[PDB]
Design a protein around this motif. Structure first.
Motif, short mmCIF file in Angstrom:
data_model
loop_
_atom_site.label_atom_id
_atom_site.label_comp_id
_atom_site.label_asym_id
_atom_site.label_seq_id
_atom_site.Cartn_x
_atom_site.Cartn_y
_atom_site.Cartn_z
N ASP A 1 0.83 -1.19 0.00
CA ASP A 1 0.00 0.00 0.00
C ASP A 1 0.88 1.25 0.00
O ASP A 1 1.96 1.28 -0.58
CB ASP A 1 -0.95 -0.02 1.19
CG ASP A 1 -2.11 -0.95 0.99
OD1 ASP A 1 -2.85 -1.17 1.97
OD2 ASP A 1 -2.26 -1.48 -0.12
N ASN A 2 0.35 2.34 0.54
CA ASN A 2 1.07 3.58 0.72
C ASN A 2 2.37 3.47 1.49
O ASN A 2 2.55 2.57 2.30
CB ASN A 2 0.19 4.59 1.44
CG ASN A 2 -0.96 5.04 0.61
OD1 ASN A 2 -1.21 4.51 -0.45
ND2 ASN A 2 -1.64 6.05 1.08
N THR A 3 3.29 4.39 1.25
CA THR A 3 4.36 4.69 2.18
C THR A 3 4.09 6.10 2.65
O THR A 3 4.24 7.05 1.87
CB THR A 3 5.75 4.60 1.56
OG1 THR A 3 6.01 3.25 1.17
CG2 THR A 3 6.78 5.01 2.57
N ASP A 4 3.67 6.25 3.88
CA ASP A 4 3.28 7.53 4.42
C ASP A 4 4.37 8.01 5.35
O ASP A 4 4.80 7.27 6.22
CB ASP A 4 1.96 7.43 5.18
CG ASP A 4 0.94 6.63 4.43
OD1 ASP A 4 0.49 7.10 3.37
OD2 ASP A 4 0.59 5.52 4.90
N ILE A 5 4.83 9.23 5.15
CA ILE A 5 5.69 9.89 6.11
C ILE A 5 4.90 11.03 6.72
O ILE A 5 4.21 11.76 6.02
CB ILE A 5 6.99 10.38 5.46
CG1 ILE A 5 7.84 9.18 5.09
CG2 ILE A 5 7.72 11.26 6.40
CD1 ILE A 5 8.84 9.47 4.08
N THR A 6 4.95 11.13 8.04
CA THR A 6 4.21 12.14 8.78
C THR A 6 5.20 12.78 9.74
O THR A 6 5.69 12.12 10.65
CB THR A 6 3.04 11.52 9.53
OG1 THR A 6 2.05 11.08 8.61
CG2 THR A 6 2.43 12.50 10.43
N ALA A 7 5.50 14.04 9.53
CA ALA A 7 6.47 14.74 10.35
C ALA A 7 5.77 15.84 11.11
O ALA A 7 4.97 16.57 10.54
CB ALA A 7 7.59 15.29 9.50
#
Lengths: 522, 253, 253, 93
Positions: free
Chosen positions: D2-8
């Motif tokens: 699925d997605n690769t989500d980065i949340t900073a």
């Protein structure tokens, strides 16, 4: 040599024919007024030091740059809080700015004038904390720029006091006074006037609003009154975030044509690491006078104030060690080290006169160590810390007035015109203990201003002065949550997104090695 | 696998309060940003699987792995590392920055979208060396701004080519390059530029026309006109609406 | 957790010489790139927390987790993976590439900035399919190049539309679409181009002017002009400044 | 998969010694700044921004300033506007 115009045709209307009416004026000869702007660069005054200035002192004085790890540094904080931010008082630059004779309205034939401007001290955020520490690092030059804008508005006020002049400013002189980073700012400004900086000329012109003045366009400096030049208190060299910024273009060297008369007092009894003297010794008259940094500059609170100066100082870096709970605390390496350095300090000629006015002891601390493993072995443990402590309550700040009067005499010798200190100035009148000594110090000042070598203070007067001299150097630890210091390299890392809950520890008033103040010459 | 102290083994074998706080804090951050990504018309992250991971890792109700260290985790190797989720998402959450430092190249190939949303401090897409290439290789490209937009080549050419039509428009005025024609339409005027009152008489009453004299005119509204009289004592031409200006002078002799 | 051999248990329990080299080398790389980002006016990574991590993980002076394997680490699962730092940064440091491969979208939401800095080989922001949308949704957009900047639609329209001014400037010349006006200003000339000597004759002395003869002229400067004579033997026109041309010929019969 | 989500919570930073390459395969690319300035620079080289279909550059509330150093060409279908030297040239068939 100057002449204005007796003008009475001072109006004309606006039309489509674009007419040019007339100005009829018999010519009036105009007074040539030598105008002096007194520039007063303060150190930190009756203010608190801002975070950005206090953080600069972490440079080379972090607890980590010494062998004080985060546990030992917290033990130092605890050990000091078990025994017993700071806002200072008015400096001598404040009192010199007060006594500088201002002239609002010239006399009908007054050929010389004096106006004054006062520039504050350099130290008086998170994302922006790095650039604010950079601002403090460049504060000397930026303060000279603020001096430009201050000269502009002082001139505008002065000439707005003299509407419709009949005089021509036949010279612009400068009387620049400084203390401790305004002494650095004062030296930089005196150079900028020596280089005939265009920004000074722009400032003079903007204040005069295009009027004429006959002299060097950027002015000239008559008297440079320095108190204890300390170009930088701290640094940025170890701050990872900002150490890339190069040294500011600060010019402190005072060549023979930088000012007509130059005189600097210095603190004989200032030994802190961060307060390294920039001397004008050998080159210009410089008077080493007994007292700490602000015993020369003034910023110490009076002996009755709520902000009274009570000294509870660690004169040695507290050392800790874990030992057996049976061990007597005086039978530990830390206590032996503390007593050794205490005996060294009693022998030390640097504090020869300061110590007899307070109590110099070795404080011993011992807390319990939770070591569950050694508990099973039957071994209970204690952490014994010992340092040399110095108590002195109610330190009087009346030596700054002696230095103030020595500066006043030096400046009045340079022709600077000061209002005398009258008994309505109760903050500036000396204790009866100090009258003879203030006179001898004024004589030492003149002897230096005569190129002689002054009759030094004898051991009895110096003991009398030790009562008014503050011990500025100490190993009292302070902390901050805006930095993290690398425990190994000692590199400072500013917390950009708010404090991470830690505490970085610093010895800001740490004495220089072997209690000899660093002096930089030129 | 926990670097959390549970002294004297007092507590459950799987007490993971600080690990659960980290999982909850990570998910609530990822969810705030999903709301922000929607509000900004960015592609949303896969909150469903990260919410399902919180359920699975919390108390390990499903056979997952929970690695928690209160003071940081370092997963290092000299050889290659792989973080792979075979059928679901990889979530990287940060309280501070998420920093990627590639010694060669930062490559991303997404089968769906690539979305970068910054919420407060903008976006920097810089190549210190090498060519920057932005392509919608099969579709529209839209580059927009709310405030000023600046396209600039500081030392080279700017070429803007279109295949069907090139329209520059602002406020009714437009320049359209289409067909094989140029069209400059506008509601106002089209302007082609091969380009791009009065004083005072300062004179001595005897007759000397006062050369090289300072002055500055103060209009009867609050304007200043600094200058120095010129060439028999002229001043600068004043054309304020219709005030009665004032005159002042000094100078050296 | 270490895949490093300590043969016969000779050594400290926590000998992490190679784990420390990996930590030192990663932070060393992160720090050199943080200097590069400052020089390039990119957003800087959080070196501060990655510097404490080196402190914490080196000999585990603080309760962290150090995973080292000399031959690579794989963290795989069929389900979601989470790498989350609650209060500090996640740092992905790489000696070679950092490759992200998403079977679905790849999304970033940063509360602060997004800065992608490439140091040597440029930046490719490609969408093989789908629309590329670059927005400064509340602020300025700046698209800058040192060398040539090229904006192109290979099969559609290019529309540049402003709200208050559209300026095209180069070398004093400008075109401003503003108000409702169009302004074409230049120091030089505005040119509307809405429309888009000497040789030999090789003749026989009898008189027939020798058609179809190859020739080549050499002007007396170092330029050559081939050709063939034609139908009474014309030469190509020559327009070199002030030369003395020379001639040679051959051909068929 | 699925997605690769980065949340900073702070920034998201990438510094690559070689290239930064983002390739979307099917659903486009959104490079959005909800607030703050978007700065796209080829600080030492060419910048190419291409589209196959329509390309839309827009400032919804401010100015658009295209600026070249040596030549600014707008071209479409034989027509061209060239700002070059100190001259404006409008040529079309």
């Amino acid at each position: 040599k100057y002449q204005g115009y007796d003008v009475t045709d001072a109006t004309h209307k606006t039309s489509i024919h674009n007419d040019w009416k007339v100005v009829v004026a018999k010519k009036k000869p105009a007074r040539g007024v030598t105008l002096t702007i007194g520039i007063f660069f303060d150190g930190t005054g009756n203010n608190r030091e801002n975070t950005a200035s206090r953080l600069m002192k972490f440079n080379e004085c972090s607890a980590a740059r010494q062998g004080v790890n985060q546990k030992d540094a917290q033990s130092c904080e605890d050990f000091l809080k078990e025994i017993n931010s700071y806002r200072g008082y008015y400096s001598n630059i404040h009192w010199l700015n007060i006594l500088y004779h201002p002239d609002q309205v010239l006399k009908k034939d007054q050929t010389s004038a004096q106006i004054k401007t006062y520039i504050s001290g350099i130290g008086t955020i998170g994302m922006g904390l790095g650039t604010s520490i950079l601002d403090i690092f460049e504060g000397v030059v930026t303060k000279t720029d603020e001096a430009m804008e201050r000269i502009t508005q002082a001139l505008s006020e002065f000439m707005g006091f003299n509407l419709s002049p009949d005089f021509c400013i036949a010279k612009i002189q400068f009387d620049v006074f400084g203390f401790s980073r305004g002494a650095a700012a004062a030296r930089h400004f005196a150079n900028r006037v020596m280089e005939q900086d265009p920004a000074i000329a722009r400032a003079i012109a903007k204040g005069l609003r295009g009027d004429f003045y006959d002299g060097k366009p950027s002015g000239e400096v008559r008297f440079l009154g320095l108190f204890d030049t300390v170009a930088a208190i701290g640094g940025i060299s170890n701050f990872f975030d900002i150490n890339g910024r190069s040294n500011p273009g600060v010019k402190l060297e005072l060549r023979p044509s930088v000012a007509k008369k130059v005189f600097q007092i210095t603190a004989m009894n200032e030994y802190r690491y961060n307060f390294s003297l920039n001397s004008i010794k050998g080159m210009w008259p410089e008077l080493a006078l007994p007292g700490a940094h602000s015993d020369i500059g003034g910023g110490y609170n009076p002996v009755g104030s709520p902000l009274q100066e009570n000294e509870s100082l660690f004169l040695s870096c507290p050392e800790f060690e874990i030992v057996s709970d049976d061990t007597r605390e005086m039978d530990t390496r830390v206590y032996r080290k503390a007593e050794q350095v205490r005996k060294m300090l009693m022998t030390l000629p640097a504090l020869k006169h300061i110590l007899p006015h307070g109590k110099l002891t070795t404080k011993i601390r011992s807390i319990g160590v939770n070591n569950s493993n050694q508990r099973r072995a039957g071994v209970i443990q204690k952490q014994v810390g010992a340092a040399v402590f110095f108590e002195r309550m109610a330190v009087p700040n009346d030596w700054a007035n002696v230095c103030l009067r020595v500066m006043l005499d030096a400046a009045q010798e340079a022709g600077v015109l000061f209002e005398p200190i009258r008994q309505t100035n109760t903050e500036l009148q000396l204790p009866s203990e100090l009258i003879f000594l203030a006179d001898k110090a004024i004589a030492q000042g003149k002897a230096v201003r005569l190129g002689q070598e002054p009759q030094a203070f004898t051991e009895e007067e110096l003991y009398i002065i030790g009562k008014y001299t503050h011990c500025s150097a100490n190993w009292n630890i302070e902390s901050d949550g805006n930095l993290w210091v690398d425990p190994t390299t000692g590199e400072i890392f500013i917390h950009r997104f708010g404090p991470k809950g830690n505490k970085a520890f610093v010895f800001p008033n740490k004495p220089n090695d072997r209690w000899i103040r660093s002096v930089w010459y030129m | 696998i926990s670097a959390d102290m549970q002294p004297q083994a007092q507590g459950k074998m799987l007490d993971m309060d600080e690990a659960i706080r980290q999982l909850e804090q990570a998910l609530s951050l990822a969810r705030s940003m999903a709301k922000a990504a929607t509000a900004a018309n960015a592609t949303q992250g896969d909150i469903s699987c990260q919410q399902r991971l919180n359920a699975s890792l919390t108390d390990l109700t499903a056979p997952g792995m929970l690695l928690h260290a209160p003071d940081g985790i370092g997963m290092v190797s000299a050889r290659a590392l792989r973080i792979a989720s075979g059928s679901e998402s990889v979530g990287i959450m940060s309280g501070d920055n998420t920093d990627i430092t590639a010694g060669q190249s930062f490559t991303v190939v997404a089968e769906g979208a690539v979305s970068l949303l910054s919420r407060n401090q903008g976006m920097q897409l810089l190549a210190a060396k090498g060519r920057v290439n932005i392509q919608a290789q099969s579709d529209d490209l839209s580059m927009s701004s709310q405030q000023n937009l600046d396209i600039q080549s500081s030392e080279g050419k700017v070429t803007v080519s279109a295949n069907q039509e090139l329209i520059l428009a602002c406020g009714g005025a437009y320049i359209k390059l289409s067909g094989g024609n140029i069209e400059l339409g506008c509601p106002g005027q089209i302007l082609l530029k091969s380009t791009n009152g009065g004083g005072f008489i300062l004179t001595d009453e005897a007759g000397v026309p006062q050369p090289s004299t300072p002055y500055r005119l103060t209009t009867a509204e609050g304007d200043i006109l600094q200058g120095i009289t010129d060439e028999n004592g002229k001043t600068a031409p004043v054309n304020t609406s219709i005030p009665s200006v004032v005159k002042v002078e000094f100078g050296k002799v």
